[PDB]
């Protein structure tokens, strides 16, 4: 077919190509290496390979398979690790004896000899089918039914053969579709392109929250299941602690970890720490390992796996969202995929337009966030699904106001602050009230306020108290303090306790890193009631030391009530928060007089 | 590589033959027998380079540079003490004491030979004068006391004569 | 193979595409000197190679080229330690040939068991300020950041002087369960600074367990950038082959960034912003790809690169690109070096996220990061109190601002002040940090738990 | 205190000779192993130089190297340069190089072998020929000493591991 | 200082007497099996590599 | 040999060039202008022209010499001025009648009309020789012969015929080498290329003290024999005064002056001021001009002489260091060579790095910085030599963030400060601890402070008081003098007196003379004793005006101590500084009671 014209870096150019697309995958070299032609100019097409070049010479045969290069979706996704193309690193670790993917060693997208339990769905002989419909199920990971059998998208017809219940393999057909003749046989696994998005029936608004396990995040703004939010990073300011605490504290049915580039210790520490740690929805054994999907790519891996890792993670998140379950998508980070696209653009020779980044990094980065969200599931059943996209951002263009962080912050809908200076005082993640915003607070306030919501009134006074504490802290150090009012000192003292009990958190404990929504709303309502009681008592005539000494054990119990966990009562609410209001009323009445 | 070791071996053999041609330094000449063996017979550079590259001669240029520098300092100290005669046992004990130090040109022994070489070098190209005659007699008495007493002992007469020679060299013609 | 032309360090040859990528070739010049080179890029009917040693003496028709037929590999063996070797073929490095018994590639083509094992035991070079502020474990990439205008070669010479003495305290501390190996890789640095490090390593008595690599500053950048892959390949082959802990130092990253910026002047690739190429993350990640734990628990590999900021900014491509591949960073202090304190550092922007899980049991306490967070917040409060008190005076400073200001000077002049060859355990550094941390009351600290803070203060 | 500082400064000097002896022993061991490999390779070069003195059995070895260089060249015309005692064997067996080269490839037919008046020396190359293109743009060294010297870099580790292990 | 004045002779006695017997037995054992490596290297040189 | 095909800008194209090497020096056209081959593409080679020419026709022949551009090594370099291209300026000044380089000229590499006295060394017939050995000597100076007759590098053999002592010329041969037959004859002068570094026998550590002769330079951070020093600053900092004072007051065997582009008056003022002054190293009959080599480079000169001036001066300094004498290289400045390399890179059309400077400036500066240093001399004799390179840097637009100052300051180990505000007070160059540092100051203070000196305590206390003087001046300027105490005023007055007495180099009656470390040790000990007595006297009760008026003539006598000549009663201790300790003790005793 084709011939290797020139090889420079990790990308190889092959000429003698006719009728090739921009997404078809072919084998480059004499070892049958995995690759995909991203772009082509004339007769020579440039294809990025998933392995490095360590002896590849020109004049090698390049034969295209005749179809697009994507990942295989089916049973065997959970309890597996893929680098950037869903390749078994455990098989290469035993066979090849190394950790990295070497040239000339390939593997499949899933297991072949592993048999699964096949169960028939709601289809029979002569029943109608469509793309994304529920055709069956897989009995693997028996803690929760996550493996759902779905048909390929853009393909419909009638079910001519209905396989019965029993044991089957991943290489034998059990279903056949007939729509104007025999189109093709269907197996337990299905193929789908990673560079092509998954279609849906219709988009819907977010009306369900997502428990991320953050006291300052859920206390500051209402969480949503299926929203888009960004997280600022500084390369060592508490991003991995919030990522591991957000992944462990997540209560979704599936976990999709997609890493374009990391240091390397976080991938092995997350995989080894994942099968020995129980989350909020954990079970007897394998609570995070059985329900989580591992797609980790390091900095030492190729740029093709790091660039295709976001497409494989978004395709796995859309595949898990198409089944009708709630999945949390954690991406870390977009700066590694933008750095890999800047390395591929620097190797190809494209002129950048992002101050050291690619010109299409803004549209390609903004298009990745648009493919994640809550909506109706594609197919005739029309199930309810959602995908919460949590992607971290970090500036690499040489400034904090670069176009990558501006496009990623403008395209996002949720705001999560993170400062390196505030994280050094043991207050990670230090969120900013002036740069924080949430658009789904009005829609989430109907259902959350319909159940038991009080987050808005204490949240607006908490944000105004944080802005007044920041303005008083900047004006005090700027102008110089020689006196202090009791109203600003009470707001600064309430902002210090709210920043200590809310901003202070960790990613390795559960006593001071786990709090319910009712306990956080009762603590924020108790702090807002104590701030309103101190502000109302200060207006009637009183001192600041007489107000703090009049409060006494109320602020020490409210500040010391953030290290416990729910182990009492028959619900999330506890009796310690209800008894603090009666002592806070007597302490507020005695503090005034 | 091998040409520097062959040139250092031939220069060490020429400096060893020019240092003592009477066969009196058996201790210093005993350690230099491996370089004087190839210098005692007619041989080309290809034979010394082929004999040194095949593991049959010394190839450490770093040790041969300091070993040739110690023999050049001993030959410079023995040649700088003329016309006074130094003892062979004092020259062998001075070469053994100087070779046993961690730094050869770090002590005051090299500074005394550099000061005597600068004092004799300053009077070697000057006309007869009172400061040149007094500095020549002080350099002759310093060469006789340095040849008789050695450079290992820090006597007050050698430091006073060296300080008087440096103070006389620091003066002008007025 | 006849060369058509030559532009700078790269030479263009006219021939068929018989050779492959990374194919070693021999350039025959008319001055009686043969040089070796590696093909950086291969094309159809042409090849681009870079001279490893010099570029003077390249003709068009009077000179000829010949292919060796073997890839660029450095011979590594079990006898490389205890002597001076080189991988560039120079007779001024104590032998141009190592005479190893195994042939391994410089890019990790045969094996690369890294990036798939977490750290288990902690490591300490003997600095209470560096190990106390940032938790360094076996298999982690803790880089030391430098700046233009400070003695980074003295800090790298002190880090190389500290190698070999921490191995005896590491066995008694239970941090190392095998033999210790040292790997020295020099590329782009001057010979005067490398001679002081070799004289300090020979005077310290640790030259037998360490191997020295000499790379000149007058050769091409492909040889100096290719030397760290050979040093990391020899350290990974020695760590995986013998089951020992290998600690390698790579200085300097600025010469590798300048050699990568000077490269690609005749190839099809173009440089990005600031003169450096856009694919510098892959070249910087290739040296760090051989770092980490080994497969099967067969020893470990530690890498500590020394990078000097030319502009003194934290937004450069070398510290910004190297900071993403590494974990955290250690920023040195330029004003502390002028006062007469070494090794000066700053705990304000220096933070490690994996310092909690990287630390183990039996070699360090659990309250190390709790005192480090309060010490970093006290140092930032002392710097903000000094900056706020510098403009107006003694009016905007509070009671905690004066204690943080005195604790910043006492901690900067007490913990940062240390010798170049002195060593100390983690318990002595934690006891000195706990003793120096007792300058503020317990009613104004919130970066630690009350149970661990009430027991030890 | 002064006696302790002078005792430490006087005691710190032992590591230079203590490391220099261990460096000289490790350099002498590598010099002995390289001296044994340099004699084993000298015996292999003497056996290869003695095997090149044949007149009837040496034709397929040079014909296989000329066919190997002709298969890497892929040209229709190539000049074969060899020693003064090897052009007579290739002149009487020039059809076997074109038949064996033509039977292993079909991208270009070999129709002429130009044996010029350039004779190779016998004191630097013991047997073999040098194949080059007609335009004098690409030259492939197919000598036995170049193949033994280039193959000694990969055969030296197996012989070194098998000889001292 | 006497232990450092007398230590200057141990660099040659510790290096000559340290490894002096291994260079003869290694050359004898290497010269014994030299015909196999010479025959394998001579056989590999007579064919294409 | 070749023919010019086209001439665009300062770069010319010459076709039919197949024997020209890289960086080979040749003559283009009939003008005989200097040029070099920078790049080559096929049969046409690109030759860059550095000399100005406005009459170069297209089609003129190019005559290549057959070797690269270098400088001559032999007797006759001292007491003569030469250019960067190895051309005599005195022969062009006498013959052409122009002091500058005319538009198109041709002369020999050295003076061939002056005979020298060649004497045989210790060699004989039948003795082995090598490259670097002292085969003879040439009498050039009255004190000692500076031009040592040595063999060329990479040459060895046997001495078949040795020439006797007498007068001869550089063109006539006096030595013959016998090695493998009749190889070639040797002469008094030898050639060496400027694009190849000379070899050395072995490297050594730089721990020897180098007497530069400056009290402010050796007082704060004195350099060592074989180190590297960088000095930044704008126009008007005193680079030519520090070069002439460092060359005349230096105690080295040879002085290397390299001009990389000046205004023109500084080279004539330094050349005429060099032989008109008297050297303080026991020499007469033009001792400063006889042992100093002057490289004349102007601003409008050729780019080949300015760019190759550092390589020619580094090659001549490497030959003088290889001959056995210690040489100190003073260059000012590398910004003209970096601007010439950036101008050649901009005219050649290559990709720059930042501000028009090429990426090879770090490797070119690293090669020149690596080529200099202290080590053993090459040759059979094993002589001791040193090469101390001191090159000042300047910005390209007024900022110190350029790659030349950052690469030169980062690659160097010793830094020299410069204050713009202190330069207005006639104290340029003034820096104590805030803009300069030295790694070898500990070994230099330990080695030089062993017997004679006590510089470390007064240098440490003076560095601490100089570091506290900036905070005392900033706190006195920002807040005021009411919050400051008498110790900050005494330390501020001691920092102004030590900065005015040490940083000040321009007198008011005459030029400053040479001053050793023993002369500056009495002033630093008098300033430390005056600061300690003034600070200790204020503790027991004393006015600041009574002590500052109690000082009196000590500040005026300390200012005029640098104008007087040394050796006024002693070499290590002076009689003028002894009265300041008794006067400070009497004023401190009278100020207490």
Buried b / exposed e over C187-196, threshold 16 CB at 10 Å, is bbbbbbbbbb
Nearest CA to A281 out of A216, A229, A326, A313 is that of A326
Q: Which residues make beta-bridge pairs with F340?
A: none
What whole-number distance in Å separates Cα of residue F339 and Cα of residue F405? 12
Q: C-alpha angle F353/A397/C380, rounded to 5°?
A: 110
Residue in B closest to F155 by C-alpha: B3
CB atoms within 10 A of CB F376: 22
User: Could you check whether the bond before residue A222 is cis, i.e. omega within 30 degrees of 0?
Assistant: no
* 3-class secondary structure, B70: helix
Q: Tokens standing for E18? A: 């340290």
Q: Which residues make beta-bridge pairs with A40?
A: A45
Concatenating the DSSP letter of every residue in C223-258 gives: HHHHHHHHHHHHHHHHHHHHT-EEEEEEE-HHHHHH
Concatenating the DSSP letter of every residue in B75-136 gives: HHHHHHTTTS---HHHHHHHHHHHHTSS-GGGSHHHHHHHHHHHHHHHHHTS---HHHHHHH
Helix axes C426-436, C368-391, angle to 10 degrees: 40
User: Could you check whether the bond before residue F333 is cis, i.e. omega within 30 degrees of 0?
Assistant: yes
Concatenating the DSSP letter of every residue in A527-561 gives: HHHHHHHHHHHHHSS--HHHHHHHHTHHHHHHHTT
Interface test with D, best of E19, E45, E46 (most D CBs within 10 A): E45
Only one residue has tokens 């002779």, namely E9
What whole-number distance in Å separates Cα of residue B134 and Cα of residue A184? 117
Sheet holding F147-150, edge to edge: F147-150, F134-138, F116-120, F166-168
φ and ψ at residue A51, rounded to 5 degrees: -130, 160
CA torsion, ordered F560, F563, F569, F574, to nearest 10 deg: 50
Q: Tokens standing for F132? A: 């670097």
Nearest CA to C289 out of A336, A100, A11, A53 is that of A100
φ and ψ at residue A151, rounded to 5 degrees: -80, 165
DSSP E strands, F447-536: none
Sheet holding A157-162, edge to edge: A128-129, A157-162, A175-178, A182-186
Q: C-alpha angle F470/F475/F478, rounded to 5°?
A: 120
User: Could you check whether the bond before residue B83 is cis, i.e. omega within 30 degrees of 0?
Assistant: yes
**Residue A236, marked binder:** yes
Concatenating the DSSP letter of every residue in C50-91 gives: EESS---S--SSS-EEEEEEEE-EEEE-TT-TTSEE-SS--T
Whether the CB-CB separation of F419 and F444 falls below 8 Å is answered with no
* 3-class secondary structure, E22: helix
E10 touches chain D (CB under 8 A): yes
CB atoms within 10 A of CB C455: 9
CB atoms within 10 A of CB F546: 12
Concatenating the DSSP letter of every residue in D97-127 gives: HHHHHHTS--SS----EE--S-EEPTTT--S
Q: Collect all residues with Cβ–Cβ distance below 8 Å to F32 and sequence separation of at least 6.
A: F104, F105, F106
* 3-class secondary structure, A116: strand
Interface of C with A in 329-388 (CB under 8 A): 329, 348-349, 351-354, 356-358, 373-374, 376-377, 380-381, 384, 388
Interface E:F, ≥3 CB–CB pairs < 8 Å: no
What whole-number distance in Å separates Cα of residue F127 and Cα of residue F581? 63
Q: C-alpha angle F501/F507/F509, rounded to 5°?
A: 135
The DSSP letter of residue A211 is: -
Exposed, middle or buried, D117 (CB in 10 Å: 0-12/13-18/19+)? exposed
> What's the longest Cα–Cα distance across chain E?
65
Q: C-alpha angle F537/F539/F545, rounded to 5°?
A: 55
Nearest CA to C412 out of C313, C328, C342, C349 is that of C342
Exposed, middle or buried, C23 (CB in 10 Å: 0-12/13-18/19+)? buried
Whether the CB-CB separation of A309 and A260 falls below 8 Å is answered with yes
Q: Which candidate from D19, D27, D29 shows the least CB-CB separation from C202?
A: D19
What whole-number distance in Å separates Cα of residue A307 and Cα of residue B163? 77
φ and ψ at residue A328, rounded to 5 degrees: -105, 125
CB atoms within 10 A of CB A40: 17
Q: How is chain F split into domains, by residue range?
A: 1-69, 70-113+187-438, 114-186, 439-593
What whole-number distance in Å separates Cα of residue A12 and Cα of residue A5? 8
The DSSP letter of residue C313 is: -
D14/C205 CB distance under 8 A = yes
Residue F2, CB-side half-sphere exposure with 13 Å CA sphere: 29
* 3-class secondary structure, A566: coil
Nearest CA to F443 out of F413, F412, F417 is that of F413
CA distances in angstroms from C267 to C159, C264, C276, C287, F94, listed in the order given: 38, 5, 14, 22, 50
| Pairing state between β C84-85 and C210-213 | parallel
The CATH number given to D39-165 is: 3.30.2320.30
Q: Tokens standing for F92? A: 């062009």
Resolution in A: 7.9
φ and ψ at residue D28, rounded to 5 degrees: -75, -30
User: For A354-369, what is the HEC assignment?
Assistant: CCCCCCCHHHHHHHHH
E4/B99 CB distance under 8 A = no
Whether the CB-CB separation of C16 and A51 falls below 8 Å is answered with no
Whether the CB-CB separation of F443 and F208 falls below 8 Å is answered with no
Whether the CB-CB separation of A24 and A65 falls below 8 Å is answered with yes
Helix (H) / strand (E) containing F297: none
DSSP E strands, C112-200: 144-147, 180-186
- Binding-site residues of F for ATP sit at 233-240
User: Could you check whether the bond before residue A194 is cis, i.e. omega within 30 degrees of 0?
Assistant: no
What whole-number distance in Å separates Cα of residue A146 and Cα of residue F434? 66
* 3-class secondary structure, F354: strand
What whole-number distance in Å separates Cα of residue F377 and Cα of residue D116? 51
φ and ψ at residue A583, rounded to 5 degrees: -75, -25
φ and ψ at residue F388, rounded to 5 degrees: -105, 110
What whole-number distance in Å separates Cα of residue A224 and Cα of residue A440? 7
Nearest CA to F188 out of F337, F74, F357, F304 is that of F74
Exposed, middle or buried, F263 (CB in 10 Å: 0-12/13-18/19+)? exposed
Whether the CB-CB separation of F41 and C7 falls below 8 Å is answered with yes
What whole-number distance in Å separates Cα of residue C159 and Cα of residue C421? 9
Interface C:D, ≥3 CB–CB pairs < 8 Å: yes
Nearest CA to C246 out of C298, C189, C168, C194 is that of C298
Interface of F with C in 206-265 (CB under 8 A): 206, 226-228
Only one residue has tokens 């807002």, namely A528
What whole-number distance in Å separates Cα of residue B127 and Cα of residue B143? 21
User: Could you check whether the bond before residue D9 is cis, i.e. omega within 30 degrees of 0?
Assistant: no
Q: Radius of gyration over alpha carbons of chain B, in Å?
A: 19
Nearest CA to A124 out of A160, A71, A82, A168 is that of A160
Q: Tokens standing for A325? A: 């379950």
Only one residue has tokens 């450092």, namely E4
* 3-class secondary structure, C135: coil
Chain B nearest CA to E4, separation (Å) = 8
What whole-number distance in Å separates Cα of residue C106 and Cα of residue C115? 17
What whole-number distance in Å separates Cα of residue A32 and Cα of residue A341? 24
Whether the CB-CB separation of C3 and C11 falls below 8 Å is answered with yes
Only one residue has tokens 């021939």, namely C15
Q: Radius of gyration over alpha carbons of chain D, in Å?
A: 26
Q: Tokens standing for A584? A: 């806070």
Nearest CA to A385 out of A394, A395, A373, A397 is that of A373
Residue in C closest to D24 by C-alpha: C83
Chains in touch with F (≥3 Cβ pairs < 8 A): B, C
H helices of F136-278, in order, are: 215-220, 239-248, 265-276
Interface D:E, ≥3 CB–CB pairs < 8 Å: yes
What whole-number distance in Å separates Cα of residue D150 and Cα of residue D38? 14
Q: Collect all residues with Cβ–Cβ distance below 8 Å to A393 and sequence separation of at least 6.
A: A230, A231, A232, A233, A333, A334, A335, A404, A405, A408, A409
Concatenating the DSSP letter of every residue in F519-555 gives: HHHHHHHHHHHHHHHHHHHTTTS--HHHHHHHHTHHH
**Residue A238, marked binder:** yes
Q: Which residues make beta-bridge pairs with A11?
A: A8, A48
DSSP E strands, A333-461: 375-376, 384-393, 414-415
C188 touches chain F (CB under 8 A): yes
Whether the CB-CB separation of A355 and A397 falls below 8 Å is answered with yes
User: Could you check whether the bond before residue C343 is cis, i.e. omega within 30 degrees of 0?
Assistant: yes
φ and ψ at residue C284, rounded to 5 degrees: -75, -30
Nearest CA to A213 out of A243, A238, A233, A236 is that of A243
* 3-class secondary structure, A142: coil
Q: What experimental approach yielded this model?
A: cryo-EM
């Amino acid at each position: 077919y084709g011939a290797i014209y020139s090889v420079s870096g990790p990308v190889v150019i092959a000429e003698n190509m006719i009728g090739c697309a921009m997404y078809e995958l072919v084998k480059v070299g004499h070892d049958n290496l995995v690759g995909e032609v991203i772009r082509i100019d004339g007769d020579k097409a440039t294809i990025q390979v998933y392995e490095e070049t360590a002896g590849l010479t020109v004049g090698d045969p390049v034969l295209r398979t005749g179809k697009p290069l994507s990942v295989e979706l089916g049973p065997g996704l959970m309890e597996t690790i893929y680098d950037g193309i869903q390749r078994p690193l455990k098989a290469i670790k035993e066979e090849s004896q190394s950790i990295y993917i070497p040239r000339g060693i390939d593997t499949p997208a899933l297991d072949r000899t592993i048999k699964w339990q096949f169960t028939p769905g709601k289809f029979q002989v002569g029943d109608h089918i469509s793309g994304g419909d529920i055709y069956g199920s897989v009995f693997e990971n028996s803690l929760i039914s996550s493996h759902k059998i779905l048909l390929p998208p853009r393909s419909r017809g009638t079910i001519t053969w209905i396989a019965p219940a029993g044991e089957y393999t991943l290489d034998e057909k059990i279903l056949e579709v007939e729509f104007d003749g025999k189109k093709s046989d269907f197996t337990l696994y299905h193929t789908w392109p990673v560079r092509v998005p998954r279609p849906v029936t219709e988009k819907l608004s977010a009306d369900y929250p997502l428990l991320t396990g953050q006291r300052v995040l859920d206390a500051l703004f209402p969480c949503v299941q299926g929203g888009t939010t960004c997280i600022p990073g500084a390369f060592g300011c508490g991003k991995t602690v919030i990522s591991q605490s957000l992944s462990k504290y997540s209560n979704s049915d599936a976990i999709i970890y997609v890493g374009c580039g990391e240091r390397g210790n976080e991938m092995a520490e997350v995989l080894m720490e994942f099968p020995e740690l129980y989350t909020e929805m954990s079970g007897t054994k394998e609570p995070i390992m059985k329900r989580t999907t591992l797609v980790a790519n390091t900095s030492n891996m190729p740029v093709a796996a790091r660039e295709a890792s976001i497409y494989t993670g978004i395709t796995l998140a859309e595949y898990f969202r198409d089944q009708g379950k709630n999945v949390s998508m954690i991406a870390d980070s977009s700066s590694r995929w933008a750095e890999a696209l800047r390395e591929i653009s620097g190797r190809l020779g494209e002129m950048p337009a992002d101050q050291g980044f690619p010109a299409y990094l803004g549209a390609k980065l903004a298009s990745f966030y648009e493919r994640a969200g809550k909506a109706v599931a594609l197919g005739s059943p029309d199930r309810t699904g959602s995908v919460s996209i949590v992607a971290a951002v970090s500036p690499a263009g040489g400034d904090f106001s670069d176009p990558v962080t501006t496009a990623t912050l403008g395209i996002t809908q949720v705001f999560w602050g993170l400062d390196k200076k505030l994280a050094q005082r043991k207050h990670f993640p230090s969120i900013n009230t002036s740069v924080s915003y949430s658009k789904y607070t009005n829609v989430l306030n109907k259902f959350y306020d319909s159940n038991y919501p009080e987050f808005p009134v204490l949240r607006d006074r908490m944000k105004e108290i944080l802005s007044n504490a920041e303005e008083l802290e900047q004006v005090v150090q700027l102008v110089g303090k020689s006196a202090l009012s009791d109203s600003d000192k009470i707001t600064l003292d309430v902002a210090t306790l709210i920043k200590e009990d809310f901003l202070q958190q960790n990613g390795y404990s559960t006593y001071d890193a786990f709090c319910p929504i009712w306990k956080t709303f009762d603590m924020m309502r108790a702090f807002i009631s104590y701030h309103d009681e101190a502000q109302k008592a200060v207006a009637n005539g009183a001192n600041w030391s007489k107000l703090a000494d009049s409060t006494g054990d109320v602020k020490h119990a409210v500040s010391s009530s953030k290290f416990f966990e729910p182990s009492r009562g028959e619900k999330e609410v506890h009796g310690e928060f209800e008894k603090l209001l009666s002592t806070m009323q007597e302490r507020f009445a005695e503090s005034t007089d | 590589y091998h040409s520097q070791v062959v040139g250092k071996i031939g220069y060490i053999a020429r400096c060893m033959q020019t240092i003592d041609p009477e066969n009196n330094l058996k201790k210093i000449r005993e350690d230099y027998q491996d370089v004087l063996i190839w210098a005692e017979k007619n041989y080309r550079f290809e034979e010394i380079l082929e004999a040194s590259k095949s593991g049959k001669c010394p190839n450490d240029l770093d040790a041969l540079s300091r070993r040739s520098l110690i023999l050049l300092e001993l030959l410079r100290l023995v040649s700088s003490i003329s016309p006074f005669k130094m003892k062979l046992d004092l020259i062998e004990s001075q070469y053994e004491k100087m070779k046993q130090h961690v730094n050869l040109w770090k002590s005051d022994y090299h500074v005394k030979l550099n000061q005597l070489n600068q004092l004799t070098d300053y009077l070697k190209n000057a006309a007869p004068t009172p400061k040149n005659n007094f500095l020549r007699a002080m350099t002759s008495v310093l060469q006789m006391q340095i040849a008789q007493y050695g450079i290992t002992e820090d006597n007050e007469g050698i430091n006073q004569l060296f300080k008087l020679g440096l103070h006389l060299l620091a003066m002008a013609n007025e | 193979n006849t060369v058509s032309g030559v532009n700078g360090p790269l030479v263009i040859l006219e021939k068929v595409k018989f050779p492959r990528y990374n194919e070693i070739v021999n350039l025959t010049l008319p001055d009686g000197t043969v040089r070796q080179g590696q093909v950086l890029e291969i094309r159809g009917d042409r090849a681009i190679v870079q001279v490893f040693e010099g570029t003077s003496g390249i003709d068009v028709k009077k000179t000829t080229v010949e292919f060796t037929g073997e890839s660029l590999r450095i011979p590594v063996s079990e006898d490389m330690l205890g002597r001076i070797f080189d991988g560039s073929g120079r007779p001024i490095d104590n032998g141009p040939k190592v005479f190893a018994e195994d042939y391994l590639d410089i890019n990790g083509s045969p094996i690369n068991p890294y990036a798939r094992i977490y750290p288990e035991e902690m490591i300490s070079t003997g600095v209470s300020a560096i190990d106390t502020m940032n938790s360094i474990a076996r298999g982690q990439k803790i880089p030391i950041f430098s700046a233009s205008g400070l003695p980074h070669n003295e800090i790298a010479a002190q880090i190389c002087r500290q190698a070999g003495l921490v191995r005896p305290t590491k066995d008694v501390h239970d941090g190392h369960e095998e033999n210790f190996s040292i790997v020295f890789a020099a590329m782009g640095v001057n010979l005067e600074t490398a001679r002081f490090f070799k004289q300090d390593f020979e005077e310290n008595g640790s030259l037998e367990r360490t191997s020295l690599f000499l790379n000149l500053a007058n050769d091409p950048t492909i040889e100096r950038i290719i030397t760290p892959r050979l040093a990391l390949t020899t350290a990974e082959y020695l760590a995986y082959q013998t089951e020992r802990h290998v600690l390698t130092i790579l200085t300097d990253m600025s010469s590798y960034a300048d050699a990568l910026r000077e490269v690609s002047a005749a190839r099809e690739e173009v440089p990005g912003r600031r003169g450096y190429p856009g694919y510098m993350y892959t070249d910087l990640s290739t040296i760090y790809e051989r770092a980490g734990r080994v497969e099967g628990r067969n020893g470990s590999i530690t890498q500590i690169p020394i990078l000097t900021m030319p502009n003194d900014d934290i937004t450069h491509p070398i510290p910004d690109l190297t900071g993403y591949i590494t974990e955290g960073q250690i920023f040195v202090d330029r004003q502390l070096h002028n006062k007469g304190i070494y090794p000066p550092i700053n705990v304000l922007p220096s933070l490690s996220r994996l310092m909690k899980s990287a630390i183990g049991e039996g070699m360090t306490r659990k309250d190390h990061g709790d005192v480090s967070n309060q010490l970093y917040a006290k140092y930032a409060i002392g710097k903000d109190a000094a900056a706020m008190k510098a403009v107006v005076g003694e009016e905007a400073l509070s009671i905690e601002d004066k204690l943080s200001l005195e604790f910043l000077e006492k901690f900067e002049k007490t913990f940062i002040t240390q010798g170049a060859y002195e060593d100390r355990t983690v318990f002595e550094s934690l006891d000195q940090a706990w003793s120096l941390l007792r300058i503020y009351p317990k009613e104004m600290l919130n970066r630690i738990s009350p149970k661990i803070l009430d027991e030890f203060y | 205190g002064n006696f302790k500082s002078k005792l430490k400064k006087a005691m710190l000097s032992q590591q230079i000779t203590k490391s220099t002896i261990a460096n000289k022993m490790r350099l002498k061991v590598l010099s002995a192993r390289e001296q044994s490999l340099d004699g084993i390779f000298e015996e292999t070069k003497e056996k290869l130089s003695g095997i090149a003195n044949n007149r009837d059995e040496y034709k397929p070895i040079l014909q296989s190297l000329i066919v190997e260089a002709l298969l890497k060249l892929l040209e229709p015309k190539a000049i074969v340069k060899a020693l003064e005692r090897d052009v007579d064997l290739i002149e009487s067996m020039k059809d076997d190089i074109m038949r064996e080269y033509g039977e292993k490839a079909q991208r270009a037919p070999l129709e002429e072998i130009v044996i010029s008046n350039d004779y190779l020396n016998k004191d630097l190359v013991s047997g073999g020929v040098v194949v080059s293109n007609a335009s004098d743009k690409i030259e492939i060294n197919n000598t036995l000493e170049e193949r033994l010297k280039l193959l000694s870099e990969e055969a030296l580790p197996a012989i070194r591991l098998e000889l001292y292990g | 200082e006497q232990k450092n004045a007398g230590g200057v002779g141990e660099l040659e006695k510790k290096a000559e007497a340290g490894v002096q017997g291994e260079l003869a037995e290694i050359k004898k054992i290497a010269e014994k099996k030299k015909d196999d490596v010479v025959k394998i290297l001579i056989e590999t040189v007579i064919k294409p590599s």
